[PDB]
Amino acid sequence: STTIQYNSNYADYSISSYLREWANNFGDIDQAPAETKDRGSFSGSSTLFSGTQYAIGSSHSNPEGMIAEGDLKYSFMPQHTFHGQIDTLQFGKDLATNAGGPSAGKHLEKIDITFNELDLSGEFDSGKSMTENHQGDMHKSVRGLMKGNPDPMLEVMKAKGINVDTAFKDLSIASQYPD
Numbered sequence: 001s002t003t004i005q006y007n008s009n010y011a012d013y014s015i016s017s018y019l020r021e022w023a024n025n026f027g028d029i030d031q032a033p034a035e036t037k038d039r040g041s042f043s044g045s046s047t048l049f050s051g052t053q054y055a056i057g058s059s060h061s062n063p064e065g066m067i068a069e070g071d072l073k074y075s076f077m078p079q080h081t082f083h084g085q086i087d088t089l090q091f092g093k094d095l096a097t098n099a100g101g102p103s104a105g106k107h108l109e110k111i112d113i114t115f116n117e118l119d120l121s122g123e124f125d126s127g128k129s130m131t132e133n134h135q136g137d138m139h140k141s142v143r144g145l146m147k148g149n150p151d152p153m154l155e156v157m158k159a160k161g162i163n164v165d166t167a168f169k170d171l172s173i174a175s176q177y178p179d
């Protein structure tokens with residue numbers, strides 16, 4: 001059921017070439033200066049580590065950002081596992097916070113690509129170990145991206161049957177945003 005909407009500027013990108021470009025600019029969070037690091041934030045001020053939206057911008061002073069929407073959960077200490085389910089995933093640049101400050105949620109001022117009905121899931125079991133819990137699709141794919149590495153996400157997409165080697169122009173599941 002996954003579909004994709006893309007800005008016309010990316011009609012001649014593929015999922016692979018887009019996410020590589022995006023991830024190379026976003027950069028590896030672990031390599032970032034501590035004082036410019038953005039670990040992301042969840043909407044919904046009653047809960048620091050879960051919510052319907054998770055937004056994260058480059059820790060390397062670049063404008064690249066990503067927004068995930070769904071039933072989003074993060075276990076924080078000590079297993080640091082991102083789990084639940086991502087229905088919609090959006091990439092672009094220039095993350096800005098919504099009216100209301102830090103847990104109001106965010107938007108991208110420049111939206112490049114949106115994945116719809118992504119069904120990107122993962123489970124967390126407090127009785128399992130960290131290395132086991134990190135095997136979930138949702139965790140390893142998003143964690144890869146925050147580490148400037150799109151390969152885990154691309155592998156998930158391919159395993160789903162999504163073609164990542166083809167121009168958005170020429171992907172049956174993709175349609176262009178009206179300019």
Ligand code: HEM
Pocket residue numbers: 039040041042048049074076079080081082139142143146
């Ligand atoms: C509100 C959002 C988040 C906050 C405030 C946060 C905070 C932290 C902090 C303070 C650490 C320990 C220091 C470090 O290793 O850099 C950490 C580690 C880590 N974070 Fe999170 N994080 C967030 C979201 C995420 C997400 C969404 C993921 C995965 C997709 C993630 C994955 C990890 C991993 C794998 C570690 C390392 C655990 C280890 O190997 O010791 N974090 N995070």
